[model samples]
Structures are given as C-alpha cells and as structure tokens.
Target: LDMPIMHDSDRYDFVKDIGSGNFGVARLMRDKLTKELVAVKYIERGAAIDENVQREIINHRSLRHPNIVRFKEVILTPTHLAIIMEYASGGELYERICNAGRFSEDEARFFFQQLLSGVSYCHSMQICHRDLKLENTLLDGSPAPRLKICDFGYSPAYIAPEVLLRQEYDGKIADVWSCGVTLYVMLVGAYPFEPRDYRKTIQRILSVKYSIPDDIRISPECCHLISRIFVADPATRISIPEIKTHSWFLKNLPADQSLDTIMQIISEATIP
Candidate 1:
C-alpha cells in the first residue's frame, strides 16, 4: 500500500510530539482553518492498517460520551493515515500522581468513580475496552482533573453466543479486570504483580496472587472490591454496574453525585 500524503491545505501546524509506541507517533496539532487544537496520530499505511484500527474508528465514531476521548475525523491519502482526535491538555493521570507524591483517599475515590462511570457506560453499550491502564486515561484542564478514557486501539466489541454453553469470556469482564489493575496502580506506585520473568507476571495475573502494599493505608473494603474484579474467573468477577453499588465504593462516596460536584471535590482534593 502506498503511504497517504497530506496536502498543504489539509496539513495542520504540528505542535509537539506527545506519545509514541510500536504503531506510530502522536503529535499535538492545530487545525489550519478552525484553529482548534487536536492530536494527530500518524501511522504507515501498509501492514500496520489492520482490523484493530478499523474497529476502533468504527466503534468510537458511533459511541458518544463526555468521558471518552472524541474522534474528530480520519484523514487518509495515498501514503499515510492521520487520526484527528480531541486534545487533552493536562496529560496522563499516572504522571500527575507520581509528581504529586500520592493521592488522598478522597481524591482517589473521586477519580475512580468517574473512571468506573465511563467504563459502565461503555460496557452497557457492549463495548469492551481491552486496555484500561492509567496510561490510557487522560486528564484535562477542568478544575478537578476530569478523566477521559482514551486509546481505543485495543478495544474490541462483544458478541454474545446463542446457546448458554461454556464459552470463553471476552466481554466486559476483561475490561473490569483492567480497571482493577488501574485502581491498584492508583493506590500504589506500580503494578501489584511484578515478577522477574514476563511469564511469571502472566501467571500471577492469572492466579490473582498480587497483594496490596503493606505501607499503603487503603481500606479492607477497597482491597476486597479490587480482588473481586481481578479474579481469574471472568464469570465470577464483578460487573461494572455491580461495581457502582459495591459496598466499598458506596461507603466511600455517593453514587448519584453530579459531575460538577464530583469535579469540584476532585479539584479541591487533588490540587497542591
């Protein structure tokens, strides 16, 4: 496949390169006409163009939410493909936590609530976000660090089977598992189950052998909720809806709080 070429008219002012991985680089750019800031992801058009990219574009285009990063449009030419996306000014939540030392319990609760709210909405729409790490979540300039779940490159849709026979679980539970990992990371500085060997890490994830750090002062209820979500048995894991009503979360904060109020609390608590 020939690389997509960007015409001068279509080209935007490149601000700075934000992130990169095996796929390609993401650069902050401003639309030449609208003067709106956007993130343009540049990817080669050959074998890199796969089902994952197609699925993400299709899924994200149809799905709408305040908490999910908005996909503006896709620009394709003969030589390359550029995905124009909403800009997040505040950067990754993980970086913020690291720089601030650690989050207060209230502060953590507020962010977690918003995160799960977005996840619940996605799951309700039958969208399974296979990757839900802290790195994938973005914070904007709102008073409180409002979170928007980004990076749908790894998300896959769920297909239900006609019969109730035993089958592989790949729906929302997998997403919840990732959320559990995110919660664990937020409370502590790193992933719970880090092993010397990569295979051992996989085994630990499968076995759910990771334990909360003794130094952290998280509540037992929080630990219980995380454990339930991280269970290897996907069928037995807590659903997103169930997570909202979980005793641990409910005991910590109100489930029906408005977005503004939640943001206010988060802002007051998280800001130095």
Candidate 2:
C-alpha cells in the first residue's frame, strides 16, 4: 500500500485575510499553478471535527452552478481545516444594496432570476440551502455583475415559520420563504418582518404579516408573487417552477443554461 503526502499550502500562496465569523476566518489565496484567486475559509482544528463539517463539505462540492460560489477543495493545515472556494471580487450583495439603497424592480428581478436558477438547481439535487439571505449572495467582477450565492451554512431572520415552531417541514419550501425575504429586502432596503423589536418580528413572521411601504412603488405583479411566497403553510407556498413561470419573472428573462449543459458541467466538476 502506498500513500502520497502532499501539502496544500505549497500549492497556494496566501494573499490576505478577507473575512472572519463564528465559523472561521476567510483568506484570499492565489493558486500557484493556475494563478487564480480563491477564498479559503479556515475552521479551527479541534475536537469539533464533527459530522456537520463532513456534511457541509460534501453538500457544497456537489453543487456546480454559475450562480453558486464554486467549491475547489478542502485542505487541512496543522491547526485548521480550510475550504477553498471561488472568490467574488465584486463583494457581497448585501453591501451592494446598502450602497445603492435598494434596487429598482427590473434590477431586483435580474438578481432574483439568478438566485432562483441556482436555488432551483439545488432543489433538483435534493439539497436545500437552509441559509439564504442577501449577505450570503455575492457578485463577480463583471460589468453586468453576475450574482453568485455563497455559504450554505444552515443557520439564520430568514428562518421559515414551520422551522421556528419546531414542526416538520420541507427544506425546499423553507428555502422559498427565505428567498421571498431576500427579494423584499432587495426592493425595500429593509427586512420585511422586522419592526425593530425582536419579539414583534418573530410574531410578524409567525402571522405571515408584512407589507410593501406605500412609498416603495413596486409593481402589482411583484406584490402578488411576494404574497404567494409568504404563505404560512409550506404546502400552499409558491414552488420554484411556479415562480419561474410567473409573468413578473418571465419578463426580460436572460438566457440561462439548459439542463443538459448544466449536467455536463456538474459531471466535469465532480471529477477530483
């Protein structure tokens, strides 16, 4: 039996620290061979090397889509476990919204289309990203700025009512509710359910109570879709397919990958 010892650090040069969170510290690194920019999230190596860590890596690596932050490889350091992933130079979508102070209907729809496409693909693979929010969405360094979703870390405002109630729920359905909240934030510049009081916000979410401000001026069709997505009953909520076919969504639809093309890419990505 033969085992090869390869050091991951030797393959990449660390650039700088990009972010830090409860999960780990993120660093920008350049692949020596390809000279490509990548973000490596470093989780502390300790007794906490649990099943969830294995599940997160497995779940993320299988997701290969343009709208998703590409997973490269997981590397182990002496004191940390690092996850290599695509680096979005344009930064987080949450920052973009804060700077722009909300988006127009057409602009919001553009990003929403990409979000739905990626989410739809994830659902097809039977993986539900329990965490879906603006902060997790990123934009690449392109003129039009393609939206790419990052961080499948399941834990979140974006929480579905059924989840809060500790009832059995379909993750896919829960994901839809999170998407609805993201869409509302994009258009309104604020969280729909937040009354600035934590308890009230939870109550609002439980009651499915939210409304577009009269001054916001969003379209009726858009409002209608929001209504559909905000249903308290998971069974009654709008499905991804229904959202795609909604008139509001169909307007100015951009060309996206066909199922066959995506399948081909996924197969290629699946290769070690």
lDDT of 1 by residue, 209-255 (tens): 78777887988888888877766666787887788788878876945
Clashing pairs in 2: none
Question: What lDDT does each candidate get?
Answer: 0.66, 0.77
Tell me each candidate's TM-score: 0.75, 0.85
lDDT (Cα) of model 1: 0.66
lDDT of 2 at 71: 83
1-272 in candidate 2: lDDT tens per residue? Answer: 01112246688886776444322346777999999888776555544444576567677888999999888876555555556788888877888889989998888998999999989999998988457778778899898888888866522359889998866779999999999998999999998898478888989999988989998798889999999999999889999999989998888877772444433433333333
Provide backbone clash counts, one per model. 8, 0
Q: Which residue segments of model 1 deviate by more than 4 Å?
A: 1-14, 17-24, 32-35, 154-167, 251-272
